[PDB]
Structures are given as structure tokens and as C-alpha cells.
Amino acid sequence: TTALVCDNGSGLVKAGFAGDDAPRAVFPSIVGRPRHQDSYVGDEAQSKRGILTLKYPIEHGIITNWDDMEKIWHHTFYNELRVAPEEHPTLLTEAPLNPKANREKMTQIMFETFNVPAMYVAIQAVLSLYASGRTTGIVLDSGDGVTHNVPIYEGYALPHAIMRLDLAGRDLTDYLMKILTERGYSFVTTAEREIVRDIKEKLCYVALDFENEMATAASSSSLEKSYELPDGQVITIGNERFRCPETLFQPSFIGMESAGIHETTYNSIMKCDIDIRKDLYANNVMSGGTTMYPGIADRMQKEITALAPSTMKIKIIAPPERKYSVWIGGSILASLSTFQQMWITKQEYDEAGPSIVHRKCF
Amino acid sequence: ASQHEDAWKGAGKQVGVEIWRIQQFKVVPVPKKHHGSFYTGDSYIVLSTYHPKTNPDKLAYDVHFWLGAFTTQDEAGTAAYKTVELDDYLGGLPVQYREVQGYESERFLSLFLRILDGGVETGFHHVE
Ligand SMILES: C=C1[C@@H](C)[C@H]2[C@H](Cc3ccccc3)NC(=O)[C@]23[C@H](OC(C)=O)/C=C/[C@@](C)(O)C(=O)[C@@H](C)C/C=C/[C@H]3[C@@H]1O
Ligand SMILES: Nc1ncnc2c1ncn2[C@@H]1O[C@H](COP(=O)(O)OP(=O)(O)O)[C@@H](O)[C@H]1O
Ligand SMILES: [Ca+2]
Ligand SMILES: [Ca+2]
Ligand SMILES: [Mg+2]
Numbered sequence: 095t096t097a098l099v100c101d102n103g104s105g106l107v108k109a110g111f112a113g114d115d116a117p118r119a120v121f122p123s124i125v126g127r128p129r130h131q132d133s134y135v136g137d138e139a140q141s142k143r144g145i146l147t148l149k150y151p152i153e154h155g156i157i158t159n160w161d162d163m164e165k166i167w168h169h170t171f172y173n174e175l176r177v178a179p180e181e182h183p184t185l186l187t188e189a190p191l192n193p194k195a196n197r198e199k200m201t202q203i204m205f206e207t208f209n210v211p212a213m214y215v216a217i218q219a220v221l222s223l224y225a226s227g228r229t230t231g232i233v234l235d236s237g238d239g240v241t242h243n244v245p246i247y248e249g250y251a252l253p254h255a256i257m258r259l260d261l262a263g264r265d266l267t268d269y270l271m272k273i274l275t276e277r278g279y280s281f282v283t284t285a286e287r288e289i290v291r292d293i294k295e296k297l298c299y300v301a302l303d304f305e306n307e308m309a310t311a312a313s314s315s316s317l318e319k320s321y322e323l324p325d326g327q328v329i330t331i332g333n334e335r336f337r338c339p340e341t342l343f344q345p346s347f348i349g350m351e352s353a354g355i356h357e358t359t360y361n362s363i364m365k366c367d368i369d370i371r372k373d374l375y376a377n378n379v380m381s382g383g384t385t386m387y388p389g390i391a392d393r394m395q396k397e398i399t400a401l402a403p404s405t406m407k408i409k410i411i412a413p414p415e416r417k418y419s420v421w422i423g424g425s426i427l428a429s430l431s432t433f434q435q436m437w438i439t440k441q442e443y444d445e446a447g448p449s450i451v452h453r454k455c456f
Numbered sequence: 457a458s459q460h461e462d463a464w465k466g467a468g469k470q471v472g473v474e475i476w477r478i479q480q481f482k483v484v485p486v487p488k489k490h491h492g493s494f495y496t497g498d499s500y501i502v503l504s505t506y507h508p509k510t511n512p513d514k515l516a517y518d519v520h521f522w523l524g525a526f527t528t529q530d531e532a533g534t535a536a537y538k539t540v541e542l543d544d545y546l547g548g549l550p551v552q553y554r555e556v557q558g559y560e561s562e563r564f565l566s567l568f569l570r571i572l573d574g575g576v577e578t579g580f581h582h583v584e
């Protein structure tokens with residue numbers, strides 16, 4: 095009996111088998127329907143977004159289209175992994191501070207629709223910490239929907255100190271679409287959103303000193319990069335390369351009054367007991383695709399240094415595989431017999447209903 | 457819940473050092489004659505049971521997990537999870553310490569230290 099591990103990201107499904115060192119199925123968490131008023135899922139919807147309008151059933155870590163999310167789960171089991179879900183205990187993941195109905199309904203569908211024999215819901219940032227080989231540290235996890243800071247001490251998240259920001263990769267893609275349109279291009283449609291997401295992933299970076307980089311960009315073309323669109327046109331991107339992820343540190347770039355990710359990290363540490371803060375500062379672990387920008391670790395090191403006491407030892411850990419750290423932490427934990435002992439069984443669900451998730455998970 | 461791990465049965469019952477190695481996700485005891493020798497390719501859990509200053513007839517606990525320079529991600533992650541489990545098994549009383557080869561704390565060094573080449577194979581299946 096092999097367990098399944100499914101990390102349902104706002105942007106990407108990462109799924110596979112406990113004990114594997116990587117997810118065997120990674121595909122867009124999207125459902126596509128004809129743009130001209132049937133449905134397609136995942137890579138295939140992405141492949142012919144030319145005639146589809148694409149919709150994400152998860153927004154900011156929360157399932158907002160339960161009918162389409164069921165389609166995504168069905169596709170993951172039957173079409174990608176090609177397994178029978180009733181035969182596999184399944185580990186799911188969630189961002190912290192979600193509305194409680196989200197994981198209640200995840201539990202209901204898994205047992206009532208897919209008839210899994212057992213399941214469990216784990217906090218994403220905690221899985222990433224264990225994947226880094228730590229029990230104490232503070233995780234910054236940023237995917238396509240949510241950025242969250244979770245400080246963890248002796249293996250347990252500290253919920254009073256968790257910080258959450260509904261600003262992540264999709265907001266950055268949207269912002270690149272906006273500022274590229276201001277350069278003379280026009281990126282508006284859901285298909286064009288996917289083009290700009292690819293530009294973002296290939297060409298953006300976090301400037302170490304934003305004002306200096308802005309001046310470098312005006313002084314010459316040294317920072318400019320070219321990009322070939324699907325139709326063959328070649329565009330040029332300049333200071334948009336680093337203005338787009340600058341939004342993580344300056345959320346006002348998209349009209350948000352929130353603290354930037356350096357400040358939320360600092361605020362999260364300051365919510366923790368004084369005597370553990372040095373260990374948190376020395377163990378800042380980044381996970382998720384929106385932590386993949388070149389330059390982000392160095393920028394975080396600089397910004398936290400400016401916020402922290404002058405002698406504080408600060409370290410950013412940026413695992414090269416951190417687009418998959420949540421999944422890998424799940425694959426490790428689901429390979430342990432005692433972790434699976436804690437899972438919700440179908441029988442327990444039958445007797446207790448969706449509330450069972452709060453007794454056995456959170 | 458930690459009661460389902462055979463490795464913890466009888467752990468921490470007297471003053472001394474107990475050591476387990478992670479082997480393909482399992483917690484495997486290290487025989488006493490090898491305590492202090494660590495494979496650079498592996499990850500370990502070290503439970504130090506001692507008498508606290510407050511009462512010479514009672515027991516307190518430091519739990520160290522030791523990560524070899526060449527240990528694989530599955531081994532380090534299992535060592536972390538199972539350290540938390542052993543901590544819970546002992547009622548939360550153990551204080552946890554993460555020890556990386558070449559960076560071991562003064563506390564860890566004081567328990568003994570020989571580093572051995574190689575180690576046991578990863579528990580991961582490699583996805584091509
Ligand atoms: C991976 C997760 C679980 C395995 C728990 C894990 C500790 C643990 C380790 C080994 C054996 C048992 C427990 N670390 C956590 O933060 C968890 C752990 O969950 C449980 C039930 O132990 C933490 C619970 C709290 C209350 O501290 C929370 O923060 C709670 C709101 C969110 C749940 C977090 C859990 C996380 O999803
Ligand atoms: N190299 C990169 N640079 C910047 N952003 C990236 C990079 N790679 C992926 N991303 C972004 O990360 C997000 C997907 O990461 P992931 O951790 O899978 O998110 P989720 O778990 O929410 O699906 C998307 O916004 C994607 O554009
Ligand atoms: Ca090994
Ligand atoms: Ca403890
Ligand atoms: Mg994610």
C-alpha cells in the first residue's frame with residue numbers, strides 16, 4: 095500500500111507517490127472552456143489555450159470553484175497518475191489561515207467522491223521545513239496564490255506568529271502584464287496571462303538596490319532582454335524585469351498597503367518568544383516558485399539585516415529544489431508508518447463527518 | 457501515537473546515550489560499541505538522558521539529530537520528524553538540537569567522535 099502525496103497549489107498540481115524523490119505529475123491547476131460561448135484540464139488546456147478561456151479553481155490558496163476543483167482531482171488520479179484513489183491513502187496540503195470550510199470540504203470530497211481509504215491535511219510550510227532537515231526555523235512559502243510565514247519550534251508551527259499575505263505569483267504575473275502593456279505591448283486575456291507568466295519566470299530578478307537598478311536601466315540597455323512570443327514577434331523587456339518582483343518588498347506597487355515579505359518575516363519572528371528568535375533568524379527557509387527569482391535570497395538577507403538588531407546572525411536557506419520542497423516533505427512524512435497512523439480513516443469520516451479534520455489535523 | 461514506533465520502547469530509562477540511524481525511513485538502533493562513530497552519508501538521532509541539577513534521582517533529556525555531510529534529503533527529513541516524535545514520546549521534555557557534521561555543538565561534542573566514509577543507501581526512489 096503506497097500513499098499518494100498531492101500538493102494542490104494555486105497555480106500547479108504537484109502529485110505523486112510517497113517515497114519518490116519528486117512528484118511524477120506537475121501540471122497547471124486550470125480548467126479551460128471554449129472562449130467562444132466541454133472542458134479541458136491541465137497541460138492539455140494549456141496546450142490549446144488559443145481557443146480556450148482558462149480558469150483557476152484555486153485563488154489565493156482557497157478553492158473558489160468546487161466543481162472545477164473536483165475536475166482537477168479527478169484528472170490527477172485517473173488521467174495523470176492513473177491510479178484508483180480508493181486504493182491509496184492520500185496526503186493533501188494547505189496554506190495556513192484558510193477558512194475552515196476549505197479543508198472540511200476537501201475532506202468531504204476525498205472520502206465521499208473519491209473514496210480514499212485514509213487522508214491527512216498538512217500545513218505546507220511545515221512540510222518544507224522538514225524537507226530542509228530542520229525542526230526549528232521560519233519558512234517563507236510563496237506560490238502562485240499565497241505568501242505565508244510560519245515560524246516552527248521543535249517541530250511544531252507557532253500559529254499565533256504565522257503571517258499571511260494574499261500576494262504571490264499570480265499577482266506578480268498580473269502586474270507584469272500591466273507594466274508591459276504600459277511599454278506598448280498588450281497582454282490582457284487569460285491566454286496572454288500564461289505568456290506573461292512564462293516571461294516572468296524566465297527573465298525577472300530581484301534587484302539588490304531597487305533605486306540603483308532603476309538608474310542603471312535608464313543609463314544604458316545593459317539590463318534589457320529579448321523574448322519570442324508564440325506568434326513569432328520578439329519583444330524587449332527592461333526595468334520590468336525587476337520592477338515586477340519588487341512588488342514582494344513594496345506591495346504598494348499593486349495598491350496594497352501590506353508589509354513586504356522582509357517585514358512580514360521580521361514581524362513573524364518578533365511574535366515569537368525572545369529566546370528562540372536567534373534560531374529563527376539563522377534558519378529562514380524559502381519555499382515555493384515565487385521564491386525562485388534570482389537575487390531574492392540576497393535581497394532578503396539585506397532587508398532583514400536592516401530590520402533586525404545590528405549584531406543578529408541572519409541566514410537565508412534557498413534550496414535549489416524549493417519549487418518542490420512542500421511535496422518532498424510530504425513524500426518523506428507519508429513514508430513513515432507512524433505518520434500514517436495519524437491519518438483520518440474512511441471509517442472515522444463515516445462516523446464523524448468533515449469535522450474529523452479538525453481533531454486529527456487542525 | 458509515538459507508541460507505534462518500536463525504537464522508542466525502553467528509551468530514556470536510565471542515564472546514558474542512545475543512538476539510532478535512519479535506514480530507508482526506518483529508525484534503526486546503533487550498537488553501543490559504535491556510539492561516537494557516524495557515517496558521513498547518514499543521519500542519526502542521539503538521545504542523551506541525564507540527571508538535572510534540580511533532582512539527582514530524576515531524568516532529563518537532550519535529543520540531538522546529527523546530519524552527515526553527505527546524507528540524503530529523505531534521511532535528514534526522517535531524522536527531523538522522528539526527533540519530534542521521540543520528544544513527544546517523552547512528554548515534550550527533551551530539548552532538541554540539530555547537529556551538522558563539522559558544526560556540532562559543544563553539548564554534542566561533550567557526549568564523546570569519529571566520522572566514517574560512506575553510509576546506507578537512500579530510501580528515495582529516484583524519478584527519472
Ligand atoms: C505537518 C504537520 C503535523 C505533522 C504537525 C507537526 C508536528 C508533529 C510531528 C510529528 C508527529 C506529530 C506531530 N508540525 C506541525 O506543525 C503539525 C502540528 O499538528 C499536530 C496535530 O500535531 C501542529 C499543530 C499546531 C496547533 O501547532 C498548528 O500549528 C496547527 C494550527 C497546524 C498543524 C500543524 C501540523 C502540520 O501540518
Ligand atoms: N523561476 C521563477 N521565477 C519567478 N517565479 C516563478 C519561477 N518559477 C515559478 N514561478 C512562479 O511560482 C508560481 C508557481 O509556484 P508553485 O510553488 O508551484 O505555486 P503553487 O504551489 O501555488 O502552485 C507561479 O506564480 C510561477 O509563475
Ligand atoms: Ca545515507
Ligand atoms: Ca521538547
Ligand atoms: Mg504551493
